[PDB]
Enzyme design. Structure first.
Site, PDB file in Angstrom:
ATOM      1  N   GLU A 152     -33.440   7.567 -35.881  1.00 60.95           N
ATOM      2  CA  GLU A 152     -32.375   7.731 -34.894  1.00 60.95           C
ATOM      3  C   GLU A 152     -32.319   6.467 -34.047  1.00 60.95           C
ATOM      4  O   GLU A 152     -33.340   6.040 -33.499  1.00 60.95           O
ATOM      5  CB  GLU A 152     -32.592   8.978 -34.034  1.00 60.95           C
ATOM      6  CG  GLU A 152     -31.363   9.338 -33.207  1.00 60.95           C
ATOM      7  CD  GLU A 152     -31.649  10.405 -32.183  1.00 60.95           C
ATOM      8  OE1 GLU A 152     -32.608  10.210 -31.416  1.00 60.95           O
ATOM      9  OE2 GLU A 152     -30.874  11.384 -32.078  1.00 60.95           O
ATOM     10  N   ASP A 167     -30.295  10.041 -20.576  1.00 58.64           N
ATOM     11  CA  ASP A 167     -31.560   9.384 -20.861  1.00 58.64           C
ATOM     12  C   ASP A 167     -32.367   9.208 -19.584  1.00 58.64           C
ATOM     13  O   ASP A 167     -31.831   8.816 -18.540  1.00 58.64           O
ATOM     14  CB  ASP A 167     -31.322   8.026 -21.526  1.00 58.64           C
ATOM     15  CG  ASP A 167     -31.038   8.150 -23.008  1.00 58.64           C
ATOM     16  OD1 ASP A 167     -31.901   8.691 -23.729  1.00 58.64           O
ATOM     17  OD2 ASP A 167     -29.940   7.734 -23.448  1.00 58.64           O
ATOM     18  N   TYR A 195     -29.868  19.257 -34.029  1.00 53.84           N
ATOM     19  CA  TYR A 195     -30.769  18.722 -33.011  1.00 53.84           C
ATOM     20  C   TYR A 195     -31.196  19.872 -32.110  1.00 53.84           C
ATOM     21  O   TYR A 195     -30.448  20.290 -31.225  1.00 53.84           O
ATOM     22  CB  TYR A 195     -30.094  17.616 -32.204  1.00 53.84           C
ATOM     23  CG  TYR A 195     -31.080  16.726 -31.464  1.00 53.84           C
ATOM     24  CD1 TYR A 195     -31.909  17.239 -30.463  1.00 53.84           C
ATOM     25  CD2 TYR A 195     -31.185  15.380 -31.762  1.00 53.84           C
ATOM     26  CE1 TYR A 195     -32.811  16.430 -29.786  1.00 53.84           C
ATOM     27  CE2 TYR A 195     -32.090  14.566 -31.095  1.00 53.84           C
ATOM     28  CZ  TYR A 195     -32.896  15.096 -30.109  1.00 53.84           C
ATOM     29  OH  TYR A 195     -33.785  14.284 -29.443  1.00 53.84           O
TER      30      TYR A 195
HETATM   31  O1  LIG Z   1     -33.012  11.849 -29.437  1.00 56.09           O
HETATM   32  C1  LIG Z   1     -32.848  11.604 -28.292  1.00 56.09           C
HETATM   33  N1  LIG Z   1     -33.860  10.927 -27.510  1.00 56.09           N
HETATM   34  C2  LIG Z   1     -35.097  10.492 -28.122  1.00 56.09           C
HETATM   35  C3  LIG Z   1     -36.008  11.715 -28.222  1.00 56.09           C
HETATM   36  O2  LIG Z   1     -36.177  12.312 -26.964  1.00 56.09           O
HETATM   37  P1  LIG Z   1     -37.474  11.833 -26.065  1.00 56.09           P
HETATM   38  O3  LIG Z   1     -38.691  11.843 -26.962  1.00 56.09           O
HETATM   39  O4  LIG Z   1     -37.669  12.784 -24.909  1.00 56.09           O
HETATM   40  O5  LIG Z   1     -37.251  10.432 -25.539  1.00 56.09           O
HETATM   41  C4  LIG Z   1     -31.588  12.061 -27.568  1.00 56.09           C
HETATM   42  C5  LIG Z   1     -30.739  12.994 -28.128  1.00 56.09           C
HETATM   43  C6  LIG Z   1     -29.622  13.392 -27.408  1.00 56.09           C
HETATM   44  C7  LIG Z   1     -29.378  12.871 -26.140  1.00 56.09           C
HETATM   45  O6  LIG Z   1     -28.264  13.249 -25.384  1.00 56.09           O
HETATM   46  C8  LIG Z   1     -27.853  14.581 -25.491  1.00 56.09           C
HETATM   47  F1  LIG Z   1     -28.906  15.457 -25.473  1.00 56.09           F
HETATM   48  F2  LIG Z   1     -27.016  14.890 -24.457  1.00 56.09           F
HETATM   49  F3  LIG Z   1     -27.163  14.690 -26.659  1.00 56.09           F
HETATM   50  C9  LIG Z   1     -30.233  11.941 -25.592  1.00 56.09           C
HETATM   51  C10 LIG Z   1     -31.335  11.546 -26.315  1.00 56.09           C
END
Ligand SMILES: O=C(NCCOP(=O)(O)O)c1ccc(OC(F)(F)F)cc1
Ligand SMILES: O=C(NCCOP(=O)(O)O)c1ccc(OC(F)(F)F)cc1
Ligand SMILES: *Cc1c(COP(=O)(O)O)cnc(C)c1O
Ligand SMILES: [Cl-]
Ligand SMILES: [Cl-]
Ligand code: NA
Ligand code: NA
EC number: 4.2.1.20
Lengths: 396, 265
Positions: free
Chosen positions: B49, B60, B175
């Protein structure tokens, strides 16, 4: 699925992470419920009258228009408690938060004005208020920060990104995404995701309702045009809303032209930006050719927001409202003129609306026109800004 | 191309979960990000990703906020990101590549043109962080027209209507969101009801994300019925800690991914 239409034509919507949709849906349901509830309306009206000071005056400005065929009235939101129109809608949103059982308020602020309005409403209604402010804005708005702290609000500087309003906005949304069960996000203009453009309009629409009643009483007819500055859109849609169906009444919104549109240093996304999706909404915004969100500029911090409410973009697209811009220098001249000839110190935000009305008068001084300028705030806060510019250019 | 389907079938044939790291393209620079990504794959990443630097990443937490700023400090643009994506796919023909996008970068030069560009460089999926399923119609239609899987968040609160929409509209993987709030490895998350209904509704296989930072979280996610786990902030913190030590960064990155990947059996 929503109760109300989240769009104004192509503009608006609910462009938030999935985790925040329940909070927006909860808020929309509470608002729709509140709008049908005579007890809510009575409480809101009582705060507006006995705490905020509504109705506000409608002042005829005789000296400014002398020798022309313009009749100019100012709607005196500068006389509202807090010195700006923002107080109207924070009182409504604070009552909504209580209707929802929320005991905490999150707010964003750039110029400090919405932060102060959120803090005073929270102090009155016994809510615990936290305010996100970009660190650059904290530095240049120390008086408003101190007002917020005097009112018991917690002011949280934001250092991420460009450390200004949009970055405070992000941080408010990040917080609300984890805290919405107990906190309400008291958004500060008629923009952002649905239902906020609708709620803020409905909680500001008494500006136009009163204006209509007052001008009918004084002049026996509707205005030819009503004119309001546009940073995010709340004071303008508050003045416009009750006139939208009076098709003879012109609606004129004034964006900040900053140092001039051709300089790129301005705050006029509606007429000179590009539609994008951010701030939870599809709306015109200042952005790079790549789609990164840009910085706006205005002498007036309250107009320094790089997008605009979606209902304004819609009213423009169908021709119902017209949008123009006014430069720093034009707003400064309107500020000086009102002080000297009417004894009213206008907010530099509102001075943009006044400046355009003065242009409408001066360009066609034999045109018969009945104008209302929304005087969205008073300009005590701006006298140091105006002093320093006047001294730097050799007027003082 | 059916890279997620091929990967999940192969993982199911090995009784194995997926491990999927997240990084920001161009953090801390283009050349060293390309090396970072090759090391994550070499250490056992099942899929990628990849974030495109955006001025206002409102989903984020601080860790990935800082990754965007590091990328911007290097002058990384979306155009440069798509050049990287093409090179990554040319090096690695079978690994699924998913983008994490904010809506304005997708909408900017046209929604259809964005997904066409994804298809041309070999991207497999796009998750638009600030497009909820209720607003997703033009995005998922453009995605499917260009053989891109649109990825949707299934939050902890999800009611049955959301579950049905996510199951019907998403492809590639679901997800599965561990908690509320924003990303960050400093806030750990939590379900057997969500995973079961998603299976009942023929949803795309579920990957758990947000706060996956320890190997036993990977095993717990697979044990709960998810197809694997995504880890973001935990990886990006290794990049943050070793900015001054390029080669140490690649070595710590390799060790962590290998540890995480081993946990998915
Ligand atoms: O995959 C993502 N981040 C990396 C994994 O999360 P983390 O390990 O906590 O950094 C991730 C996925 C979706 C996102 O925005 C939303 F939820 F609104 F769609 C923001 C980050
Ligand atoms: O303009 C905004 N607030 C005005 C603050 O007023 P002031 O204190 O005068 O700067 C503003 C705040 C939030 C917003 O949407 C979202 F939450 F999504 F970011 C859009 C505009
Ligand atoms: C905040 C502010 C504005 C601009 O905000 P809108 O939402 O566009 O009304 C205008 N005038 C004053 C006095 C303000 O404080
Ligand atoms: Cl629409
Ligand atoms: Cl593109
Ligand atoms: Na604006
Ligand atoms: Na600015």
């Amino acid at each position: 699925t929503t109760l109300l239409n989240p769009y104004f034509g192509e503009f608006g919507g609910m462009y938030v992470p999935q985790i925040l949709m329940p909070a927006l849906n909860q808020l929309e349901e509470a608002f729709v419920s509140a709008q049908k509830d005579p007890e809510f309306q009575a409480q809101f009206a009582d705060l507006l009258k006995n705490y905020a000071g509504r109705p506000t005056a409608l002042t005829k400005c005789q000296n400014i228009t002398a020798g022309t065929r313009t009749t100019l009235y100012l709607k005196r939101e500068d006389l509202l408690h807090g010195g700006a129109h923002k107080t109207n809608q924070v009182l409504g949103q604070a009552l909504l938060a209580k209707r929802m059982g929320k005991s905490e308020i999150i707010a964003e602020t750039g110029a400090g004005q919405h932060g102060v309005a959120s803090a005073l409403a929270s102090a009155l209604l016994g809510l615990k208020c936290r305010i996100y402010m970009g660190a650059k804005d904290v530095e240049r708005q120390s008086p408003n920060v101190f007002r917020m702290r005097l009112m018991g609000a917690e002011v949280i500087p934001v250092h991420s990104g460009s450390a200004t309003l949009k970055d405070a906005c992000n941080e408010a949304l990040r917080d609300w995404s984890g805290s919405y069960e107990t906190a309400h996000y008291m958004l500060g203009t008629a923009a952002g995701p649905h239902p906020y453009p609708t709620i803020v309009r409905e909680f500001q629409r008494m500006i136009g309702e009163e204006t209509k009643a007052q001008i009918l009483d004084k002049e026996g007819r509707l205005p030819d045009a009503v004119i309001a500055c546009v940073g995010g859109g709340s004071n303008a849609i508050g003045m416009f809303a009750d006139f939208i169906n009076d098709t003879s009444v012109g609606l004129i919104g004034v964006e900040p032209g900053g140092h001039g549109i051709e300089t790129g240093e301005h705050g006029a996304p509606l007429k000179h930006g590009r539609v994008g999706i951010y701030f939870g909404m599809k709306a015109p915004m200042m952005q790079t050719a790549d789609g990164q969100i840009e910085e706006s500029y205005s002498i007036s911090a309250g107009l320094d927001f790089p997008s605009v409410g979606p209902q304004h973009a819609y009213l423009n697209s169908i021709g119902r409202a017209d949008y123009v811009s006014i430069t720093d220098d034009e707003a400064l001249e309107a500020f000086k003129t009102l002080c000297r000839h009417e004894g009213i110190i206008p907010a530099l935000e509102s001075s943009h609306a006044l400046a355009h009305a003065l242009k409408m008068m001066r360009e066609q001084p034999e045109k018969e026109q009945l104008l209302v300028v929304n005087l969205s705030g008073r300009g005590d806060k701006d006298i140091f800004t105006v002093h320093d510019i006047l001294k730097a250019r050799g007027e003082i | 191309m059916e890279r997620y389907e091929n990967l999940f079938a192969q993982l199911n044939d090995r009784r194995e979960g997926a491990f999927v790291p997240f990084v920001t393209l161009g953090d801390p620079g283009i050349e060293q990000s390309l090396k970072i990504i090759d090391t994550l794959i070499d250490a056992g990443a099942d899929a990628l990703e990849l974030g495109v630097p955006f001025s206002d990443p409102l989903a984020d937490g601080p860790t990935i906020q800082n990754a965007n700023l590091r990328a911007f400090a290097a002058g990384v643009t979306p155009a440069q990101c798509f050049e990287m994506l093409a090179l990554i796919r040319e090096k690695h023909p079978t690994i699924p590549i998913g983008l994490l996008m904010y809506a304005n970068l997708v909408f900017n030069n046209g929604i259809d043109a964005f997904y066409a560009r994804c298809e041309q460089v070999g991207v497999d999926s796009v998750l638009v962080a600030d497009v909820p399923v209720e607003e997703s119609a033009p995005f998922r239609q453009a995605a499917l027209r260009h053989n891109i899987a649109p990825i949707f968040i299934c939050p902890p609160n999800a009611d049955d209507d959301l579950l049905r929409q996510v199951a019907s509209y998403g492809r590639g993987y679901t997800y599965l969101l561990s908690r509320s709030g924003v990303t960050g490895a400093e806030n750990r998350g939590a379900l057997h009801h969500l995973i079961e209904k998603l299976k009942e509704y023929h949803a795309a296989p579920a990957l758990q994300g947000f706060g996956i930072s320890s190997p036993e979280q990977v095993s717990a996610a697979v044990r709960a019925g998810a197809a694997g786990a995504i880890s973001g902030s935990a990886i990006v913190k290794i990049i943050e800690k070793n900015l001054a030590s390029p080669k140490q960064m690649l070595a710590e990155l390799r060790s962590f991914v290998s540890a995480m990947k081993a946990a998915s059996r």
